Amino acid sequence: MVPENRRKQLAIFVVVTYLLTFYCVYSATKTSVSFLQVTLKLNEGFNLMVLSIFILLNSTLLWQLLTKLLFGELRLIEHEHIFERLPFTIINTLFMSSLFHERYFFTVAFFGLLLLYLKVFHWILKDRLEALLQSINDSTTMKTLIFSRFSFNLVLLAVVDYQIITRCISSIYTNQKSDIESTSLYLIQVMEFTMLLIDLLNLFLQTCLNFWEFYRSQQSEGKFMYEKAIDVFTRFLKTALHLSMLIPFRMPMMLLKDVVWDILALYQSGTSLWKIWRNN
Template identity: 25%
Template sequence: MRLALFGVVSTVLTIYTLINAYIQRGQFFSTCIYISHSNASILVLFSMAIYVFIVVCKIIQKIFFGPLRAIEIEHLYERSWYAVTELCLALTVFRGEFSAKFALLLTVLIIMKIFHWLMQDRIDFMEQGINQSWLFHIRICSVIIILLLLDTILLTWTLDYTLKFGISMVIVLGFEYTILWSNALTGLLKYILHSIDLRRENPWENKSMYIFYIDLVREFFVLVCYVIFFAVIVHRYGLPLHLIRDLYVTFRSFIQHCRDLIHYKKATRNMNERYPNATLEDLTENDNICIICREEMTIQEDNNSSDVPKKLRCGHIFHLRCLKSWLERQQSCPTW
């Protein structure tokens, strides 16, 4: 409703501005000059351009994503405010180079970020194990391919521009599109893994570890990009205070993932020997329902089966596969 009202007001003001300017000047060329020198006219045309841009983005969203879920809208608001704030802080470093051209390029960057966020949310939604329609797969595949192509084109342009004209505000765009390119590639790999898992009859136990390694490699790549970008900005413009927090958060996240990987390897090493099989008495005395998968646990003839119930030192019992998947996320008993 608010967008429609904004569109009506912008359209009426734009028509009035164009007609009024033409009546006063009488010629097309003179009218253009008059509008370009009028701050009020430029403001009206700029608001109209914003409305058209929003409408085009909504059409693209309807085509490739359809209706958005409530959680996706919430994520968009949260991430958009953060992204705009970060870009505004970055502009303080390049305030002497800012122009209308770069304002347009930054607007395109924000739109690209929005579609990358939507793509990530849709791919994460696949992890719930819900079989999606063929239209969903066509849409998400199209989005991933288009975003990868656009990221590559824009990244190539920023590199070419920097090599020709030297370090400038374009380096910010190059850094951002490098991160977006890694996000799109990560999304493609995760989509492939989720698609394979959805077509399997039995749950794919190793999928979560593959996703963990993909995220780990991506975070290392992003960390390297941050370090390089930080070094270039310090050398060229001075210390960018707004980047210190992002660099620290990225570094801490990467270190935490490395620690989780080490702890997981230790916790899952020789699980058959470290954790004894639960006996029939153990299952009888305790609830024989695995609280992770909510399925009944039974004694297995094959001790190497992934469904064999394992008893922890604390006395709680879980399926071997469930315990392994839990340890990928937490290195403590699920009941604690």
């Protein structure tokens, strides 16, 4: 996580960043006439890069503190999962950001950083669920209080993503303007967000399945069958929504990139379906 010398380097970095940004702001200020001129001066390349650095650093710090607040402290397994799975999605965000040129620069990185925080949250939530399953204790039942804590985390994520996706689809429906590229960007955000939502639904059904199993074992077929059934069901939901959304737009690149893995998952689903036929 954070070694002490890395924390020292972090302190150095943050303080020199604040120093740089304050100095550049003051310099651009005292050599200007009006607010608008100093804005046009800050928009210049070098100071622009410095301010972007400042925003990025402060945003990452805010996100790290929010992580500390929600998930408490992270385990080594979670941190390893993160350090391993980050670069793939990071390069994917690089792809979708470089998909759009200087015209679409700021909001793209904005929403990309947001969704990045969201997927990280999703992965941590999944691994915390797996931990809760391993560390489960039958001394008490799956009380409405511990289950309420965990499902409260879940519903926080669900509601925030739902509000964002609804705001975005409302903006899409309202703005049938000439910048169809911005609407396509919005729909890409919708696609990523609903992929995350389907991840929520799958994990939620897995949690309710395990809780109902707990309920039956305490009060009173192989669960793997129903687990695989729900997994392939959610994969069907994904593929259906991916087609129904990307076909309308008629995208040449995102379409194939998604559907190749969709049909590989469909091959695996056909294998599991044959297994079901075997147990049918």
